[PDB]
Amino acid sequence: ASQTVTIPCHHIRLGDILILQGRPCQVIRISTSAATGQHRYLGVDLFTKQLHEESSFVSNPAPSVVVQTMLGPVFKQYRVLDMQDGSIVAMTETGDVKQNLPVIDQSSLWNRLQKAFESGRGSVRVLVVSDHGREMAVDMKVVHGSR
């Protein structure tokens, strides 16, 4: 499974990526359970496009501290070396080459990536989710030059 970070429920908005039923999903609905009062998250699996739901995890770590959280994936940042037929050639921080990294079909990512790549290839990074062996670029960033 993907490496994860804990995210307080008050910091979750529609469109955020969460782990729902063990799967990285884009949140499309946030509601309150009538039975438990907890937040319930409905999401679309980034890889399979199936719907998944999961309710928040409530914990009590210290006196008078009551916390609702969810898990989000740890995103990796890769350099883009080339774009070819709906996939990209990417490079990890350590130089490891990924020859056929898929790009999610979401929010015009491929077109935005192609536009930025053609005007400055190596300031272009992709944010990558890695789940059960599979990797996919799910967003992009233009790296500020000073970095």
Residue numbers in the entry: 29 to 175
Q: What did the authors write?
A:
Here, we present InCellCryst, an advanced pipeline for producing homogeneous microcrystals directly within living insect cells. We have demonstrated the pipeline on five different proteins (IMPDH, HEX-1, Cathepsin B, Luciferase and EGFP-µNS), representing a selection of soluble proteins of different source organisms that crystallize in insect cells in their native compartment or, in case of peroxisomes, readily in the cytoplasm or nucleus of the cells. Importantly, as shown for IMPDH and HEX-1, InCellCryst can produce crystals from native protein sequences, without purification tags or even remnants of proteolytically removed tags, within a quasi-native cellular environment. The rich source of biomolecules in the cellular environment allows the identification of native ligands by co-crystallization at quasi physiological conditions, representing a unique feature of InCellCryst.
